[PDB]
Design a binder for this molecule. Structure first.
Ligand SMILES: C[S@@+](CC[C@H](N)C(=O)[O-])C[C@H]1O[C@@H](n2cnc3c(N)ncnc32)[C@H](O)[C@@H]1O
Ligand SMILES: [Mg+2]
Ligand SMILES: [Mg+2]
Ligand SMILES: [Mg+2]
Ligand SMILES: [Mg+2]
Ligand SMILES: [Mg+2]
Ligand SMILES: [Mg+2]
Ligand SMILES: [Mg+2]
Ligand SMILES: [Mg+2]
Ligand SMILES: [Mg+2]
Ligand SMILES: [Mg+2]
Lengths: 140, 97, 55, 54, 95, 336
RNA sequence: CUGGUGAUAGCUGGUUGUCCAAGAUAGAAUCUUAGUUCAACUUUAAAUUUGCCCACAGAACCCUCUAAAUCCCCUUGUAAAUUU
RNA sequence: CAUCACCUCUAGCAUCACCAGUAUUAGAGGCACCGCCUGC
RNA sequence: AAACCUGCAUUAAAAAUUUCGGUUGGGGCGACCUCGGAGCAGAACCCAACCUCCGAGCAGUACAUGCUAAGACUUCACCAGUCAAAGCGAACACUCAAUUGAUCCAAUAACUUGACCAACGGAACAAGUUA
């Protein structure tokens, strides 16, 4: 039933195609170990706040990465203005950085390629973001 | 067994008269379901030797899932009725004598 | 509408059980007032015991 | 018994109360005195900055 | 108000009046002050003094409460050591 | 609800400030969206010596004292008797909430460290009379009283609601003996009247005109300047800044100094307003003023602040991730 | 279609002998302004004694000054007024 | 609107529809043939 | 061993009941609803809605800011609100124009406390649209 809930959450809650579900399980086996609540939050974060559709999530191996590093890199890019959240129509003012650039690239190289910020500045943001996230859990 | 109780008080009917039930008196609240209560042990008098006790006429207590399923249908045990105890008491008395 | 003050309850040290509510600054130590106790008909020491609400 | 127990507790507290009030009153003056003493110390320290100039 | 009950055919009493008001047999109605237990920390002692006292209703309110209660509440009672016993009759009242 | 005022404020800033700062705008934008670092301003009236020791235990460092010793190293000075403790660069640590001392007054005040520079740039001297326009809620007003160099003060802000907050701040921090006399005067009147009520009265004038506060606009949802109802006020906001600064300039005596401070990154409200007042005085009242150079001031505080070096007259402190103080713009102009 | 059902309608319409008598415009609250409740006004009965009209006297300084007047009100002319 | 054609989605199976059928099948849908061009 | 059934929980599906608070020619976008003051009825009181403009949803000092009690005021009703001699008890009716919220209910040994119920005399909890 642990496996059943994991796949059913992807198929029903996350509305993933059965073909897409098999690819995710084959490529990212950490999904089964991951908790259902954290996994569901990770998916909807990319779908709504980031604007990534279902086919891109499967192909980009998004679900395998840690949720925390996704928050740190995406929000920093969003606050930098390099990343634009798609509107209702789905259009973006500026082409958003590709998901492979954000996550697959190393932290030091990621800043140079897209963020264009020094290493020291990003370190302060993570501590700031962690405090905001910690207060977020306590507040909610 | 589902044991329920009425949310609303039922007015007293009197002596020799039936209570007047209202539409609101059909609202019940669950008090206790007897299926979720701790089990009890059935008291039986053994007739033939068993793994737990091998002495005929020795009163034993086991789970109701064993006496009802195995001991009683197979004739291994009998109910611990007071009359049965008196009959087996005489049988034990003859053994001592 | 920041809560600068809080409502506290002062309990008499005379053992009569008489208590009254007073307003004090949140950023302050526990008060020890000298209030009139009707039970003993004289002024007695009072001590803050529990905060009621934040004003 | 409940009336007597409450009455005895009131009497016991009232016995220690005059000393408690005096101690509480004394503590108020001591804190006020120490704060007053620090004000004198700061005035000397503030004067020292002007003293170095002159 | 139920002027005729469905089972006895007689006038009923509104229980919201019995739990709030007291009727002196002379005809007066005694009530409490609205808010004598609410936010006492922000009220002056003079204001609280006149809040924890019992007052009388006026002509219109007393007439209203008489129609909302039956005769069982307008009868003369003889409770032993009743706090309001001496208030059931008017003294030296003219017109 | 409906359209968030935060997004409307961010949209207006994004178009305007991208051109002005270029590649620096992404760095500024993150700092603006992040929480600003709070500096601890020790109350001189309270146990300043004890609190200074207490803050040093929390790894806080007095940058003002460090900046004092740097005046001789680099080779009007600045307002003395100011002690503000901040953390190291890149430290997100927050100060504990302030507490009353043995004297009954709060030991220190938490405020932006970039807001102290207009007080520092004012170059306050003992025995002077200080006029502060839009003094409420008292961020700069408290610092002036901490110095003790102002015998007479006039704190005027148009909004009585802001003024009432200022008096409570003064009561909690400033002892009543100073406030008892006519030393501190608190009024709620238009600052444009001060150019006629009291001319040449004050030697030091600090004019912090109302403006779109970038830090507050992007976070606060109440009374935002960028909401639809406040659009008319925002359009006439540059007009008010020119009139209020001009009134403060006329209020000072010749030979005095006036510091114009603004909490925004908009050039239309920082440099254009300064130039507008200078032209306005000459055309209508024939008044000439000289803007002093703040480059020497900048080089001392470069360690603890980030500065934008493309300003015509004033000095602009831009927010940064490591140094979140700002945004703050201040220009010191003296009357001749 | 029948029944609940004589559903409900702050809405529209209607409301049937004779004669006489007294009788119109302050407001407040309200999911309220097409309504209702209280007050005012009006009616009847009762009780009581003053009611109206009004001679002086009297009713704030301000922001510098400034209207017709109003309140109160003994006499007097009158017969009402208050209360239940 | 439907329409061949194309496309998406779901389903590995029987004794009352689908079906006395079995993924070259069945169902739920989009679009409206074909031909050319294009995404990936 | 396993299933079915039953009871109780947890998601989801599909449904079920109910409602669209007022003010501003209409719509859009916004503002407004309570309390205090002014233009505002020049002289007892009251009274100009809509409108124009500025505020208030506090804070501070007390800790007898205790307890009782004649006579009055009153925002045109009610609710609510306001002043107060004397007296007991102490000492030798706090400032402030507004600075506020009923009942039920909940918590508590008692005392007492709880709503931007701000649609501010307050429905325990309900949107949009119909060409
Ligand atoms: C951006 S705040 C600056 C506050 C203060 N100077 C500080 O930094 O701590 C500007 C304030 O000026 C006030 N203000 C607006 N218009 C004014 C005017 N015309 N005359 C005087 N003050 C005004 C506003 O109430 C506003 O709170
Ligand atoms: Mg009977
Ligand atoms: Mg009808
Ligand atoms: Mg109606
Ligand atoms: Mg007639
Ligand atoms: Mg078609
Ligand atoms: Mg009245
Ligand atoms: Mg309402
Ligand atoms: Mg209302
Ligand atoms: Mg009212
Ligand atoms: Mg049509």
């Amino acid at each position: 039933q642990d496996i059943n809930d994991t796949v059913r959450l992807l198929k029903e809650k996350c509305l993933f195609t059965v073909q897409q579900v098999t690819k995710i399980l084959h490529s990212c086996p950490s999904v089964l170990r991951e908790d259902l609540g954290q996994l569901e939050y990770k998916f909807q974060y990319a779908y709504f706040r980031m604007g990534i559709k279902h086919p891109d999530i499967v192909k980009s191996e998004y679900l395998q990465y840690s949720l925390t590093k996704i928050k740190q890199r995406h929000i920093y890019l969003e606050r930098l203005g390099r990343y634009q959240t798609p509107d209702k129509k789905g259009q973006t003012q500026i082409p958003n950085p590709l998901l492979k650039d954000i996550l697959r690239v190393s932290e030091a190289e990621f800043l140079a390629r897209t963020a264009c910020t020094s290493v020291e500045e990003f370190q302060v943001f993570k501590k700031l973001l962690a405090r905001e996230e910690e207060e977020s859990e306590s507040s909610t | 067994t589902v044991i329920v109780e009425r949310w609303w008080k039922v007015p007293l009917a009197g002596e020799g008269r039936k209570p007047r039930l209202h539409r609101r008196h059909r609202v019940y609240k669950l008090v206790e379901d007897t299926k979720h209560r701790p089990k009890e042990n059935l008291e039986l008098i053994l007739t033939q030797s068993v793994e737990n006790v091998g002495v005929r006429g020795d009163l034993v207590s086991v789970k109701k899932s064993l006496g009802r399923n195995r001991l009683l249908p197979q004739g291994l045990a009998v109910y611990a009725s007071p009359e049965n105890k008196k009959l087996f008491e005489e049988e034990k008395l003859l053994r001592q004598e | 509408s920041k809560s600068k003050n809080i409502l506290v309850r002062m309990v008499s040290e005379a053992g009569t059980g008489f208590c009254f509510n007073t307003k004090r600054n949140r950023l302050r130590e526990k008060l020890t007032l000298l209030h009139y106790d009707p039970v003993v008909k004289q002024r007695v020491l009072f001590v803050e015991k529990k905060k009621i609400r934040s004003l | 018994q409940k009336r007597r127990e409450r009455e005895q507790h009131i009497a016991e507290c009232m016995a220690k109360m005059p000393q408690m009030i005096v101690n509480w009153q004394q503590q108020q003056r001591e804190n006020w005195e120490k704060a007053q003493a620090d004000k004198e110390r700061r005035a000397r320290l503030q004067a020292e900055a002007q003293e170095l100039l002159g | 108000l139920t002027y005729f009950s469905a089972r006895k055919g007689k006038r009923k009493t509104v229980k919201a009046v019995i739990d709030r008001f007291l009727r002196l047999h002379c005809g007066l109605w005694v009530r409490r002050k609205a808010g004598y237990k609410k936010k006492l920390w922000k009220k002056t002692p003079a204001r609280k003094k006149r809040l924890r006292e019992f007052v009388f209703c006026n002509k219109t309110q007393s007439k209203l409460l008489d129609k909302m209660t039956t005769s069982f509440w307008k009868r003369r009672n003889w409770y032993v050591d009743d706090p309001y016993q001496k208030y059931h009759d008017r003294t030296n009242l003219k017109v | 609800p409906k359209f968030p005022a935060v997004r409307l404020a961010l949209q207006n800033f994004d178009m305007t400030y991208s051109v002005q700062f270029g590649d620096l705008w992404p760095s500024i934008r993150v700092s603006l969206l992040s929480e600003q670092k709070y500096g601890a301003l020790v109350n001189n009236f309270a146990a300043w010596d004890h609190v200074s020791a207490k803050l040093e235990q929390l790894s806080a460092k007095d940058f003002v004292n460090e900046a004092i010793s740097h005046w001789e190293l680099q080779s009007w000075a600045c307002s003395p008797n100011l002690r503000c403790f901040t953390f190291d660069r890149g430290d997100i640590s927050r100060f504990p909430p302030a507490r009353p001392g043995s004297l009954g007054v709060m030991e220190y005040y938490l405020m932006d460290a970039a807001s102290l520079l207009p007080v520092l740039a004012l170059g306050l001297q003992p025995g002077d009379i200080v006029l502060d326009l839009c003094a409420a809620p008292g961020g700069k007003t408290l610092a002036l009283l901490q110095t003790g160099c102002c015998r007479n003060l006039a704190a005027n802000d148009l909004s009585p609601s802001r003024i009432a907050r200022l008096q409570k701040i003064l009561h909690s921090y400033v002892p009543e003996e100073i406030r008892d006399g006519n030393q501190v005067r608190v009024t709620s009147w238009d600052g444009r009247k001060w150019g006629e009520l009291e001319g040449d009265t004050y030697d030091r004038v600090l004019v912090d005109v109302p403006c779109t506060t970038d830090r507050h606009s992007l976070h606060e949802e109440e009374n935002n300047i960028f909401k639809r109802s406040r659009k008319k006020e925002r359009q006439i906001l540059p007009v008010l800044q020119v009139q209020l600064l001009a009134a403060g300039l006329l209020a000072t005596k010749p030979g005095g100094h006036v510091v114009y401070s603004t909490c925004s990154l908009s050039h239309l409200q920082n440099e254009y307003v300064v130039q507008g007042a200078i032209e306005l005085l000459a055309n209508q009242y024939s008044i000439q003023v000289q803007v002093e150079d703040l480059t020497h001031f900048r080089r001392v505080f470069m360690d603890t602040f980030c500065f934008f070096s493309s300003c015509q007259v004033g000095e602009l402190v831009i927010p940064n991730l490591m140094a979140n103080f700002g945004p703050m713009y201040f220009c010191k102009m003296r009357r001749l």
